[PDB]
Amino acid sequence: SVYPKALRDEYIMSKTLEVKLAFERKTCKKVAIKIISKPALNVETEIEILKKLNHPCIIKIKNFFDAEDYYIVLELMEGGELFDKVVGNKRLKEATCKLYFYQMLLAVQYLHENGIIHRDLKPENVLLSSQEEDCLIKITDFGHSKILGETSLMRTLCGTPTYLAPEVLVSVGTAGYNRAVDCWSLGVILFICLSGYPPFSEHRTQVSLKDQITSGKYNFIPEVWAEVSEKALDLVKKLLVVDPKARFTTEEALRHPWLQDEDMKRKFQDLLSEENESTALPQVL
Amino acid sequence: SVYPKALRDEYIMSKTLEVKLAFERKTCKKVAIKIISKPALNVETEIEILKKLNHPCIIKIKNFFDAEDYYIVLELMEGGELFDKVVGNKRLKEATCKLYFYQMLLAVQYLHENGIIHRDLKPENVLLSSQEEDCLIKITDFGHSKILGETSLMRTLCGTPTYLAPEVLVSVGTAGYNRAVDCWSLGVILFICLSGYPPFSEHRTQVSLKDQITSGKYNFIPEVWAEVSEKALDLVKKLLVVDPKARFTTEEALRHPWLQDEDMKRKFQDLLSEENESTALPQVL
Ligand SMILES: NC(=O)c1ccc2nc(-c3ccc(Oc4ccc(Cl)cc4)cc3)[nH]c2c1
Ligand SMILES: NC(=O)c1ccc2nc(-c3ccc(Oc4ccc(Cl)cc4)cc3)[nH]c2c1
């Protein structure tokens, strides 16, 4: 198979990284083109979302092609995937874990604020802006994302439940906390970043991964965790809470002591203006 | 407002019954036109369903108009709504409750067999084929219906749950029993038909309707129920089961002793051929 004419007309395709590297002809700038074979639903959704959202720590869509396959043009992230930073028990310096996690929270906070649930948060979907270890991170892959509204339960709650089944009335209790699944994923991510190993795995253990996760009983190795602060460990503890309604929200996390770090936040504000310099159009005074 | 030209071109609109009576010009036959103001989703869904399904105890769609409002052309049911047969504590003869409920089960069985969940079963949506008390019933109003497939949970179960949240794994236990909400509604319907009064109501009671339903503790009045058989009461007991996974399915109901009644079933097979006579095109022998 070859690339669609319409694509080749604006872009020069290059290496693979499914995601390949491409060059926009008009600008000679680098771009990342994600190829998705033909699904429509998950692709329609992702596009609709990418177009509506705009936030520093959220990947932006530049172009899109509906051909024999789906082609999604995105801004290229020099840093690559966060996954390559933690694979094989690589341990990230805490100060940078914080810097990253802060951005992740801002992003997921943003999504939730806008009624979006990512649902597939993992190191593979966190992109770094540069080869520097101090950089911007951006969230990506909204193919599994969910959008909210009307819920139909609301619609049913408006009517008399004479003929309504018990399980549905019961569901009222927990309705509206689906977003908490993202906060779980973050907790699991932050755990990996901080310690270099996953909190729930089948490595040297006789309990099923399912049991570990539902019981919330993660694998805790003091030797490794001794290098990490108490504040950092505490936040993870409050994200890996089994009870969704008790689990921390992004807001509660952003307020947690471990995140009250001006040096880190400053460094973040600086990384922004840096990237925004090129885009800076003169302002009225 | 007036009716759309395209509608007036095939139909002569008449009384109201939102549902109005109409006459198809080509045949001078009577039809029922349901008007729905402009929602699309619930209407698109209902149409898609009505077109795919075909079953004696399921209302059939004859035509559809997408105008300033939505117009849905359906076959007219001389008998009207089952609701008008039970309002004000009217009590239906048991033999006819059975005859009706059997058809309702066949219909809901059919829906479930075809991955459809009605979700709004009630006397108002059960139509009688004639002014006779021995007649065909047909189910209608699929505006709140749900369709099944892929569930995405399956999609998630295929992957490693390293970053997956506990509440989702827990949901696995009960996933796939949404259809049971229809069986609840039937139980509630059959209760009304049999006794002339609703099993869960705020009439003379200090417990909230919600509590009644979730506890499954229905209002049982022996005086009224003394006129009804034990088999009939037993089936209702097995449909008004709080635990969805324990609740009776349509199949379990169709197998219940109270439904093992050849006189009733015969009378049903007879009502069919009767209605199918007019449609009967000569067969090869
Ligand atoms: N899940 C997605 O929807 C998605 C969306 C966009 C993505 N961009 C990458 C990516 C970016 C850079 C990589 O190394 C490089 C390669 C070249 C250069 Cl000059 C810098 C870093 C590897 C992967 N992965 C992506 C995934
Ligand atoms: N919920 C629906 O989507 C729906 C779909 C179709 C419906 N047809 C009626 C109906 C039928 C007959 C009625 O009395 C009559 C009127 C005239 C005659 Cl000659 C016989 C019975 C009343 C209501 N109600 C309907 C509701």
Side-chain angles (χ1 to χ4, degrees), chain B residues 29-40 42-43 45-47 49-50 53-67 69-80:
Chain B
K29 287 308 191 185
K30 306 180 183 179
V31 289
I33 295 190
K34 192 169 76 175
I35 301 78
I36 313 168
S37 193
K38 318 181 72 170
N42 293 6
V43 171
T45 296
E46 186 171 8
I47 301 307
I49 304 187
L50 288 185
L53 319 170
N54 101 285
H55 187 279
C57 313
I58 298 196
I59 194 69
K60 288 180 192 60
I61 181 179
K62 319 196 70 165
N63 205 339
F64 166 76
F65 295 94
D66 180 27
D69 294 304
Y70 289 108
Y71 296 87
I72 297 172
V73 184
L74 307 159
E75 40 188 10
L76 179 70
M77 293 289 281
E78 314 278 351

Side-chain angles (χ1 to χ4, degrees), chain B residues 2-14 16-40 42-43 45-47 49-50 53-67 69-130 132-145 147-149 151-154 156-203 205-216 218-226 228-229 231-266 268-274 276-277 280 282 284-285:
Chain B
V2 305
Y3 299 114
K5 201 177 174 198
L7 174 61
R8 296 173 53 217
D9 199 279
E10 299 186 40
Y11 298 92
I12 292 188
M13 295 295 305
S14 185
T16 164
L17 305 170
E18 167 67 325
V19 162
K20 314 188 75 67
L21 166 82
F23 298 110
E24 191 190 352
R25 299 177 181 271
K26 179 171 58 186
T27 68
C28 294
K29 287 308 191 185
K30 306 180 183 179
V31 289
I33 295 190
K34 192 169 76 175
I35 301 78
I36 313 168
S37 193
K38 318 181 72 170
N42 293 6
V43 171
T45 296
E46 186 171 8
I47 301 307
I49 304 187
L50 288 185
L53 319 170
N54 101 285
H55 187 279
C57 313
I58 298 196
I59 194 69
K60 288 180 192 60
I61 181 179
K62 319 196 70 165
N63 205 339
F64 166 76
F65 295 94
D66 180 27
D69 294 304
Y70 289 108
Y71 296 87
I72 297 172
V73 184
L74 307 159
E75 40 188 10
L76 179 70
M77 293 289 281
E78 314 278 351
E81 303 169 359
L82 177 61
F83 172 81
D84 291 289
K85 299 300 182 185
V86 298
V87 63
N89 300 80
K90 296 184 183 183
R91 192 118 77 99
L92 262 51
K93 188 178 300 86
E94 175 166 340
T96 115
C97 290
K98 184 180 300 186
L99 176 60
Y100 291 173
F101 200 73
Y102 178 72
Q103 292 172 74
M104 288 182 266
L105 291 166
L106 298 179
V108 169
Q109 178 184 238
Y110 176 77
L111 294 183
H112 296 174
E113 277 176 342
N114 289 273
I116 308 268
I117 307 181
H118 186 285
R119 279 181 51 184
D120 196 33
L121 287 180
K122 52 190 183 187
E124 296 84 316
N125 295 326
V126 173
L127 303 180
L128 316 178
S129 73
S130 89
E132 303 280 325
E133 66 163 319
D134 279 343
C135 64
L136 291 184
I137 66 88
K138 289 163 173 286
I139 294 306
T140 181
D141 189 18
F142 296 86
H144 287 137
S145 298
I147 310 180
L148 321 178
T151 217
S152 68
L153 181 49
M154 301 177 189
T156 64
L157 289 198
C158 288
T160 188
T162 301
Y163 311 90
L164 185 43
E167 56 269 29
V168 183
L169 286 171
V170 169
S171 73
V172 169
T174 89
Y177 275 83
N178 311 90
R179 60 188 67 173
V181 311
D182 282 340
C183 291
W184 177 270
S185 303
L186 294 169
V188 163
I189 283 175
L190 179 64
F191 184 108
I192 292 171
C193 285
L194 282 183
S195 70
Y197 78 96
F200 310 99
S201 59
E202 310 203 291
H203 189 215
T205 174
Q206 280 140 116
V207 65
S208 72
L209 192 56
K210 176 169 179 282
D211 295 336
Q212 313 183 27
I213 290 160
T214 44
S215 70
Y218 48 81
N219 189 257
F220 183 72
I221 298 167
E223 299 76 335
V224 180
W225 282 97
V228 179
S229 84
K231 291 176 167 182
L233 180 52
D234 186 272
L235 174 65
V236 163
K237 282 184 172 187
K238 288 167 183 176
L239 289 176
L240 298 185
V241 156
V242 161
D243 179 12
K245 295 189 72 180
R247 192 175 305 148
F248 255 23
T249 64
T250 60
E251 305 90 28
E252 287 179 304
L254 292 170
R255 280 170 15 198
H256 181 282
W258 187 66
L259 275 323
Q260 313 313 304
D261 182 348
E262 283 313 293
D263 264 5
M264 181 280 297
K265 295 193 175 189
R266 172 205 335 282
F268 170 62
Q269 288 298 346
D270 295 342
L271 292 162
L272 277 185
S273 61
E274 263 191 28
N276 290 338
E277 279 175 329
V284 191
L285 307 175

Side-chain angles (χ1 to χ4, degrees), chain A residues 2-14 16-40 42-43 45-47 49-50 53-67 69-130 132-145 147-149 151-154 156-203 205-216 218-226 228-229 231-266 268-274 276-277 280 282 284-285:
Chain A
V2 305
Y3 299 114
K5 201 177 174 198
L7 174 61
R8 296 173 53 217
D9 199 279
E10 299 186 40
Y11 298 92
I12 292 188
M13 295 295 305
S14 185
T16 164
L17 305 170
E18 167 67 325
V19 162
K20 314 188 75 67
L21 166 82
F23 298 110
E24 191 190 352
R25 299 177 181 271
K26 179 171 58 186
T27 68
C28 294
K29 287 308 191 185
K30 306 180 183 179
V31 289
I33 295 190
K34 192 169 76 175
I35 301 78
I36 313 168
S37 193
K38 318 181 72 170
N42 293 6
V43 171
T45 296
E46 186 171 8
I47 301 307
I49 304 187
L50 288 185
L53 319 170
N54 101 285
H55 187 279
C57 313
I58 298 196
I59 194 69
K60 288 180 192 60
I61 181 179
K62 319 196 70 165
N63 205 339
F64 166 76
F65 295 94
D66 180 27
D69 294 304
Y70 289 108
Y71 296 87
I72 297 172
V73 184
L74 307 159
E75 40 188 10
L76 179 70
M77 293 289 281
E78 314 278 351
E81 303 169 359
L82 177 61
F83 172 81
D84 291 289
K85 299 300 182 185
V86 298
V87 63
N89 300 80
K90 296 184 183 183
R91 192 118 77 99
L92 262 51
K93 188 178 300 86
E94 175 166 340
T96 115
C97 290
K98 184 180 300 186
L99 176 60
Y100 291 173
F101 200 73
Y102 178 72
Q103 292 172 74
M104 288 182 266
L105 291 166
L106 298 179
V108 169
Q109 178 184 238
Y110 176 77
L111 294 183
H112 296 174
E113 277 176 342
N114 289 273
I116 308 268
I117 307 181
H118 186 285
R119 279 181 51 184
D120 196 33
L121 287 180
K122 52 190 183 187
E124 296 84 316
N125 295 326
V126 173
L127 303 180
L128 316 178
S129 73
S130 89
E132 303 280 325
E133 66 163 319
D134 279 343
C135 64
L136 291 184
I137 66 88
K138 289 163 173 286
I139 294 306
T140 181
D141 189 18
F142 296 86
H144 287 137
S145 298
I147 310 180
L148 321 178
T151 217
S152 68
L153 181 49
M154 301 177 189
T156 63
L157 289 198
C158 288
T160 188
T162 301
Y163 311 90
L164 185 43
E167 56 269 29
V168 183
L169 286 171
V170 169
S171 73
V172 169
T174 89
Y177 275 83
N178 311 90
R179 60 188 67 173
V181 311
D182 282 340
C183 291
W184 177 270
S185 303
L186 294 169
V188 163
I189 283 175
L190 179 64
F191 184 108
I192 292 171
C193 285
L194 282 183
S195 70
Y197 78 96
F200 310 99
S201 59
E202 310 203 291
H203 189 215
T205 174
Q206 280 140 116
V207 65
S208 72
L209 192 56
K210 176 169 179 282
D211 295 336
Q212 313 183 27
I213 290 160
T214 44
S215 70
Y218 48 81
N219 189 257
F220 183 72
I221 298 167
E223 299 76 335
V224 180
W225 282 97
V228 179
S229 84
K231 291 176 167 182
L233 180 52
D234 186 272
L235 174 65
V236 163
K237 282 184 172 187
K238 288 167 183 176
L239 289 176
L240 298 185
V241 156
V242 161
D243 179 12
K245 295 189 72 180
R247 192 175 305 148
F248 255 23
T249 64
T250 60
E251 305 90 28
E252 287 179 304
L254 292 170
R255 280 170 15 198
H256 181 282
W258 187 66
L259 275 323
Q260 313 313 304
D261 182 348
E262 283 313 293
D263 264 5
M264 181 280 297
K265 295 193 175 189
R266 172 205 335 282
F268 170 62
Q269 288 298 346
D270 295 342
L271 292 162
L272 277 185
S273 61
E274 263 191 28
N276 290 338
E277 279 175 329
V284 191
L285 307 175

